[PDB]
Amino acid sequence: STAGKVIKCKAAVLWEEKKPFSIEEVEVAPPKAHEVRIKMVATGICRSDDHVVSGTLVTPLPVIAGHEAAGIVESIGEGVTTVRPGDKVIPLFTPQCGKCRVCKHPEGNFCLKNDLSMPRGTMQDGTSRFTCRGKPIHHFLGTSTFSQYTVVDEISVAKIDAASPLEKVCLIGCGFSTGYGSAVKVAKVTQGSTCAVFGLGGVGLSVIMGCKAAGAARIIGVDINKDKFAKAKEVGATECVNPQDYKKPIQEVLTEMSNGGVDFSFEVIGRLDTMVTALSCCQEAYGVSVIVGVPPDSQNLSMNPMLLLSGRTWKGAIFGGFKSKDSVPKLVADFMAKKFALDPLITHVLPFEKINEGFDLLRSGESIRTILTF
């Protein structure tokens, strides 16, 4: 029995940037008041996790990364009311405190208790529940899902359907919800519209799914890796284009293809240049462009504000604009009710011990989502 005790378990510790994860024993403290300790079942490999490795994202190291996952509650601290031992749960890398001005706002989801903006790599109380070889190890986004067991604040976990297949619904913890919500909630794609989606990984495919669900008439996938095109078309892309095939800048190509600019464009890569291209390719008077990708830390883009003065709207969002704790259970219920599919996003399923091989599949271009199973 483990409740109230330190757990010694296996985790993937990142000791320094640009090195492999080290799969080794860590100690996981029991949960304090308003904390939840979770036995992990499945975690996806998101490009944002690779950004920690590459230094694209800056977060305190050493760290247990991972933020797209699902598991089963092992124990709860004093005062927890929203989950119980045995519950299926998804950790929420964007918390929902319910109390801050953002949580109270009808359209806000980026709760002020987040650990993204100015990452501390801790629990809400500024301490860590992890040690390894006698050293304290940082959390990541309040989730740290690359571990057999994690501890999360209550505001960073959602109870989901007891009958949920956790090896699929883990994707609702980041990539599916982010892409789908970017289309249906943030952009509010309209019926009959033309969309352009830059980047055809797990998140961009989920954007396509949302554009198709919203009734778009045309959905143009854009990627430099043409191997990504067949699955993009399967989930709703009507056309795919590779910028490398053209002598013209792709914003010009997309403006021509759409007879004057697209209704909705999405940057789902993480490059400054594609963010400006994606804005430019939306119609100048009424187009909307949504930034989803995460670019290199502390780098500014350059753009001409006339792109906005003519009437364009430029926005971004974390986690598809979804209020995390309200939305995740409903997304899982909708998945159980066959309202969307997750299988098209899953290209590989590996044991957790093969985490490095899963990252190499992402980096080589082969995979969409690898699901790691504990």
Ligand X SMILES: NC(=O)c1ccc[n+]([C@@H]2O[C@H](COP(=O)([O-])OP(=O)([O-])OC[C@H]3O[C@@H](n4cnc5c(N)[nH+]cnc54)[C@H](O)[C@@H]3O)[C@@H](O)[C@H]2O)c1
Ligand Y SMILES: OCc1c(F)c(F)c(F)c(F)c1F
Task: Confirm or reject binding of residue 105 to a copy of itself (CB under 8 A).
Answer: yes
State the DSSP code for 343: G
Catalytic residue among 138, 147, 174, 265: 174
- Of 136-144, 312-320, 332-340, 343-351, the segment contacting a copy of itself by CB under 8 A is 312-320
- Of 70-78, 126-134, 217-225, 332-340, the segment contacting ligand X by CB under 6 A is 217-225
Catalytic residue among 67, 139, 206, 211: 67
Could you tell me the sign of the dihedral formed by the alpha carbons of 116, 158, 336, 67, in that order?
A: positive
Of residues 46 and 80, the one with the C-beta less far from ligand Y: 46
Instruction: List residues forming the annotated binding site.
Output: 46, 48, 67, 97, 100, 103, 111, 174, 199-204, 223, 228, 292-294, 319, 369
Task: Confirm or reject binding of residue 294 to a copy of itself (CB under 8 A).
Answer: yes
CB of 359 to ligand Y, least distance (A): 14
CB of 310 to ligand Y, least distance (A): 8
CB of 218 to ligand X, least distance (A): 18
Residue among 175, 147, 166 at smallest CA distance from 42:
166
> 62 burial class (0-12, 13-18, 19+ CB within 10 angstroms)?
middle
Torsion region of 334: left, alpha or beta (phi above 0 gives left; psi -120 to 50 gives alpha): alpha
> 143 burial class (0-12, 13-18, 19+ CB within 10 angstroms)?
buried
Q: Which of 271, 312, 323, 325 binds ligand X (CB under 6 A)?
A: 271
Task: Confirm or reject binding of residue 172 to ligand X (CB under 6 A).
Answer: no
Residue 170 designated active-site:
no
Q: Distance (Å, rounded) from C-alpha 297 to C-alpha 279?
A: 21
Q: Distance (Å, rounded) from C-alpha 354 to C-alpha 360?
A: 10
Residue 51 designated active-site:
yes
Q: Which of 14, 41, 46, 276 binds ligand X (CB under 6 A)?
A: 46
Q: Distance (Å, rounded) from C-alpha 277 to C-alpha 300?
A: 15
Write out the two tokens for 313: 């709207």
* Tally of CB atoms within 10 A around 50: 15
Of residues 34 and 47, the one with the C-beta less far from ligand X: 47
Catalytic residue among 34, 51, 138, 139: 51
Residue 240 designated active-site:
no
Mark residues 38-57: x for contact with ligand Y by CB under 6 A, - for none: --------x-x--------x
Q: Which residues, other chains included, contact 305 with Cβ-Cβ below 8 Å and sequence gap of 6+?
A: none
Residues taking part in catalysis: 46, 48, 51, 67, 174
